[PDB]
């Protein structure tokens with residue numbers, strides 16, 4: 374089964390998922406000097422006030438905080454998008470060291486981690502149908518750097534020991550994702566794909582310019598999670614990120630000067 378090891382990592386994915394070598398794969402390196410400022414781009418609209426988290430799960434790749442997407446309780450709109458996109462879940466990608474971990478890079482710089490808030494286009498009814506569409510998903514990417522602690526992330530960090538291994542899950546209600554956002558919503562945007570199999574090219578990527586800072590203690594608790602399932606040889610869950618892919622015939626647009 375695909376993973377992030379020497380024998381089943383990103384380099385091996387194309388065998389079971391040919392689209393890994395497609396025309397609009399993600400992540401990609403964001404060259405801030407070649408990114409085009411587009412004055413017609415609109416401010417991003419993040420409406421997370423009625424968000425309803427349900428639980429946190431360790432899927433063997435990363436951990437997911439899921440939300441109730443049966444109503445327009447937490448949506449992303451505006452920016453480069455048309456219509457409404459419902460938040461279904463958020464997860465992270467981190468490294469074994471602070472110098473690596475993010476999937477997207479900025480002028481080749483890699484951050485310690487990357488938060489992905491996944492939303493699907495409401496015009497497609499459900500997430501399953503959305504992924505089969507070129508504009509079915511909108512993933513808000515937010516870089517994480519190590520420094521001061523992020524208060525809004527502590528509730529997440531403290532429950533990880535309860536889902537240490539693959540398959541484990543636990544209730545996780547009333548978590549507010551607004552505590553995970555940086556001050557500015559300035560962003561870069563480009564058409565891409567899921568960064569893990571099935572690697573479907575259904576994503577409008579929106580990557581925030583301003584990263585959030587987390588403490589070394591917080592990211593350390595991320596690295597204590599396991600890739601393996603309970604009762605198996607321990608393999609720490611680290612470096613679950615896919616490297617940058619060829620931009621090909623795409624242009625990264627910036628919402629700010």
Ligand SMILES: CCc1cc2c(cc1OS(N)(=O)=O)CC[C@@H]1[C@@H]2CC[C@]2(C)[C@@H](OS(N)(=O)=O)CC[C@@H]12
Nearest residue numbers: 434464489491500501504512566567568569570571
């Ligand atoms: C709905 C299609 C589908 C998608 C996804 C999975 C299983 C799926 O079902 S399948 N292919 O096994 O029948 C498992 C891994 C999922 C992926 C959708 C995109 C996800 C949330 C990724 O988000 S990301 N990095 O922002 O692109 C992380 C894990 C990914």
Ligand SMILES: [Zn+2]
Nearest residue numbers: 374432433434
């Ligand atoms: Zn899996």
Ligand SMILES: [Zn+2]
Nearest residue numbers: 464466489568
């Ligand atoms: Zn992701």
